Design a binder for this molecule. Structure first.
Ligand SMILES: [Cl-]
Ligand SMILES: [Cl-]
Ligand SMILES: [Cl-]
Ligand SMILES: [Cl-]
Ligand SMILES: [Cl-]
Ligand SMILES: [Cl-]
Ligand SMILES: [Cl-]
Ligand SMILES: [Cl-]
Ligand SMILES: [Cl-]
Ligand SMILES: [Cl-]
Ligand SMILES: [Cl-]
Ligand SMILES: [Cl-]
Ligand SMILES: [Cl-]
Ligand SMILES: [Cl-]
Ligand SMILES: [Cl-]
Ligand SMILES: [Cl-]
Lengths: 262, 259, 260, 259, 282, 258
């Protein structure tokens, strides 16, 4: 049977719940996970990249801040087609990776956080501020944020709140240079998230001024899961990362094995 | 909504209207344009390449000869789908570039010719089976579009029944390939792209200038001799080699400068 | 007209019928064939690789063992679409290549050029699901079979999956069994199935594919007395290869650099 | 005259004194500095890499912790040979870079520390035979330079008879390597570079902070606790991973921007 | 015996004497010569690049303008050490290449491999046919010896029309006399011209391969007009030397005693990093 | 102290003593050894490559034929300088590798690691041959005269008795040779030669049949040429002109077949 052409970009929000885990998680990612992944999807993924996150900003924990990276894939076909479950060689994936990313608590003496894997079209659906901005305009502090409204909130009500109450605050702030948004493709993998936005600042201070201070003017919604914006449960209904314009980890082009420092 | 699988090869005819503009145009192309472009389309363009024009031959001006390069993309989706208009980072594009390329004049402008095609030539009209072992080719790539009010079928018939037979008869001409331009993509004015190979510039001249003198001048003619079309507006062209070092998705490593 | 999105993996079973041809065939492949091929299909083939064969095992000749390599392509469109026949530069492909590969005999008869198209993902996972590269090196025995003319395809299929595979499953020396139906509609390949069957090494391969298969009964359509009961190089081709190849050509080729 | 074969490894400790500067400094490093650097030294530098620092650990400020990266070069000739001062194209360098790194304060500064070493560690004092299969390392690279008028041999003795044994005794520390700085190349004030491995940040702290409390404070001390040297001036450091994707001569493909 | 560490940069001035030869010469260069060269010297050459020439400017012929490219190598050892004459695989080097480049006149049977008692490529690169133009292969230190104008210029200051020129004073002319003329008469004209943004120069290492050239300069302009204004118009002011081989600057015999090329800041042909075989257009 | 500039090419003759070891040895070579090696010497080795051996020819065992590969390094400094013994990260090298290569039984064969100058010292046949002249079957062979045998006398035998047989044979298209640098690492080998043929049959006709004309020297360790103890005093491999495993330029990690 045919395979459908389904160009998509996906984002995974990779946390690191303790600095003591960073070396181990980073090693698995760069030494094990890259070669396993490329081995599987080289023929139908056109780009595979990691964007390490900037240091977590003040109150970043309230936004489900991914303390390791964003992982980005560009797919030509849906990875969740059941026919794609079969692979010659399966990923080497230690259970400890779930500990390091916070999906399960360590057995030593934290509630677990879900694996958030959001599929999107390759092109942003909404361009809400900063159209025409070029790389010549300067370095961006790019705050990539995904949200999913809690169970029993009408999705249209959530959409309307996002674009009529939240985005306008972003748009008004001179500190914010770009707002982009796309609806999550929920039909692919059942992701609980509903929207991905990217919101650019000059720097962390700008991010804080708008995303913490300006957002205080918002009414607390009846569905709120925390007292302040985003009013959503960290790492379950909101995840995020702030990243640079460029990454050296463009894996299909740049990987040459796990060469170690001398 | 879905995106349609739409594999295409596109050609842009990049001119440089004065030699004094050459260093500047070339810098923008290789230092600024390449990375902006790869940044946008890496996930859905499988090949992005520049083929620098050979030196403009005698009377090449009459063929809308592109004095910088051919720019070639291979697309998996239509770049003109309205959804593709939104981009995080827009290309750095000074108005000067349009001057250097001649889109805005010294004197009327020359249009930006961006012709979409299928990935595979639709007509193999001469030299089927030529291999790279048969020798270096002087590859003359030419696009033409019939003027306002000329019936496209009459234009087509002229091309394939009058023009091509002359190329077929010349032993200087080793290859003739053609495709109809995909007009549905971007409203390109051009109607056909052809590639016509010779051994060298003299061969090109013998066939495209002298042998073509035998053609009768069409009633729609916009200049006195073949291609009888308005240079840079209804005909563009470049002669290029078989190989380019500028296969950009594979070969680019940043703008490293000479020591 | 439209071009259909048709993602596929293809395998070509490349023999070298005499050791004296190896340097010539190998030169053509790596010096001439690679750049011609990349030139043609770079924009719509996402992977192009060669997997050199391990040394032919005992009785490998009975399995149509390809003594040069497997050639693997991953396609986005069908290469057999007639619109794809046209190309600016044709491949430099002297008939000597078909002599070296055994398509044209020395002067028994020629062996067919076996070019099998498949889905990109294996259709059946029959043993060893979950195996990772960490579980160790594999002797990967890739085999394609085509039932003889006049054998009902469903009958052949039933034989393969009801009789042959259970023997593979029974053998601890066999760590993986994968299979896909050949896409016959693309290019008319005579083969019906491609399987890949992993062992630890040649001795394991032999114990199962030769000794354990003696328990099979000889089918009425047999073209040889022992499994695979099919005509070597005509109705069965194979190769044993490693997990990794350096010849991942769209990523790794830098021209024909010669040893000093 | 001849050029001397002088294979060396150098390290630069690159700080970022405020998070608000990170995006600008990183952009300059990766968009501008890389191609300028490669342009100049490609023919005589065999490796050029950046190792981004792990998040500054607690009390890391007292160790002159570089909050951006280590920059590492492998040289075939001395970059301080006066004949190498001449360059067709000079590096693009906004003054602001010195602010971002803390060399000059925002309108006292910290010096630019650029230490040359042999390509191979001179002393292997703990963990000989450790391979990459034994696990991920928290690699703490530290350079120290004894203050004005402290006898170098007395400093050395202190380092190797008092400091290193604490490292050798700590199970949390898996590796100790050291080389003397080549002071004759560029006047670097540093005297030693050590690299000291741990499993993680907490191990680092246990050893470099807690265990070192047993040391007697030297009479030359510039701060109360180990390393007893002035942060950023007489001691700099960074903790880095075993691997970097920024192996610049092999891996750089231009400043491709996120979509 | 030891091999001496001898880091050097070399330049070859590659002409193409007729446009009809261009496709053939360019094919040999990119299809045949690249892989042969990399195969031989990958272990001791750290950079190997081609910088295609800008279109020959007006009066460029009087400057020995290389109408194909500059070929540039960076060496760690001298390619002229006699021990380096031995090579497992020799360059495929038809005589046609010397025809296309102007080293020898057109003749029958020049598709033949070049002849030599030693190596064909090493002999091809010492070509000095009385009837053609010699093969100019100049060794230099890796770093310019003199920085005469434009110190501190960055790539941010703009695109350069880089005119690279080599000169060799005729037989009989005192080298010190020539040097003084160059640096006290010629260079000051370049220095005085606002159109000229950079002047760099090095002495040719003559001890390596007996190259006839004595100096390599690189002189930058904004463009072809600026080059012309300075190298043709401003240079009319110079008095003609008694040793002159032509009436106007550089007063040297084109292609024999002066060669040159104008090139861009960047080339895509950085061959050790960027070559992926001779992929042909579709 | 200074490091000396010492450009060299080295060869290692890598055997595989049983086909059942091949998948494991090859995995180790390509998955573990490559990155460990590059991690150590990237800054001072300009080339690192493997040339997989052609299938062992008849009587190849008498030439210490390497059934896995030749490993080639080009060094800028001597790897045997004791200062280079120190490495931050050591290589992962289990004793199994020595079993697979035949250095130890499960006395075995020595590890043969020969340093040469980067350029062949002697060009004895086929000077001028280009790659356009055709594919070569390149027989690379290193020999070391037994204990007690005078080196000059061995040398004379090689260049005056053996080589002229190669020169006379039209099947042999190239003869190159260099003296092994014995000062670097104590290698017992004295010469490396490379001898080209069109193919295996040509190799055999010359190296087996034509060499029967040679008198058995008094120091002979086997009855026929090369008269040296296989794997101990003669090793070899036959290889192609090209290898895809040019490791510093071509390696992208251990990507596995799907
Ligand atoms: Cl923590
Ligand atoms: Cl709260
Ligand atoms: Cl002009
Ligand atoms: Cl503008
Ligand atoms: Cl007219
Ligand atoms: Cl060939
Ligand atoms: Cl039988
Ligand atoms: Cl801060
Ligand atoms: Cl400034
Ligand atoms: Cl203090
Ligand atoms: Cl001409
Ligand atoms: Cl400019
Ligand atoms: Cl003279
Ligand atoms: Cl004159
Ligand atoms: Cl002796
Ligand atoms: Cl015997």
């Amino acid at each position: 049977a045919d395979f459908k052409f389904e160009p998509m970009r996906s984002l995974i929000y990779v946390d690191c719940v303790s600095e003591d885990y960073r070396p181990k998680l980073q090693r698995w990612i760069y030494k094990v996970h890259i070669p396993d992944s490329i081995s599987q999807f080289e023929p139908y993924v056109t780009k595979y990249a990691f964007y390490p996150s900037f240091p977590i900003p003040p109150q970043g924990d309230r936004f489900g801040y991914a303390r390791m990276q964003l992982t980005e894939h560009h797919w030509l076909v849906s990875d969740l087609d059941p026919r794609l479950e079969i692979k010659a060689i399966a990923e080497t994936f230690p259970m400890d990776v779930l500990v390091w990313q916070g999906q399960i608590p360590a057995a030593a003496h934290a509630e677990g956080n879900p694996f958030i894997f959001a599929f999107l079209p390759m092109w942003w659906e909404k361009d809400l501020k900063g159209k025409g901005r070029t790389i010549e305009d300067g370095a961006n502090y790019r705050f990539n944020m995904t949200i999913g409204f809690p169970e029993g909130v009408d999705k249209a009500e959530g959409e309307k709140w996002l674009f009529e109450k939240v985005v306008p605050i972003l748009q008004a702030a001179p500190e914010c240079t770009r707002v982009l948004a796309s609806a999550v493709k929920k039909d692919i993998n059942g992701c609980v998230m509903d929207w991905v936005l990217e919101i650019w600042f000059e720097n962390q201070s700008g991010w804080y001024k708008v995303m913490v201070d300006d957002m205080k003017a918002l009414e607390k919604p009846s569905w709120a899961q925390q007292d302040a914006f985003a009013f959503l449960k960290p790492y379950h209904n909101v995840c995020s990362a702030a990243v640079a314009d460029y990454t050296p980890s463009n894996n299909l082009a740049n990987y040459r094995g796990y060469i170690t420092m001398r």
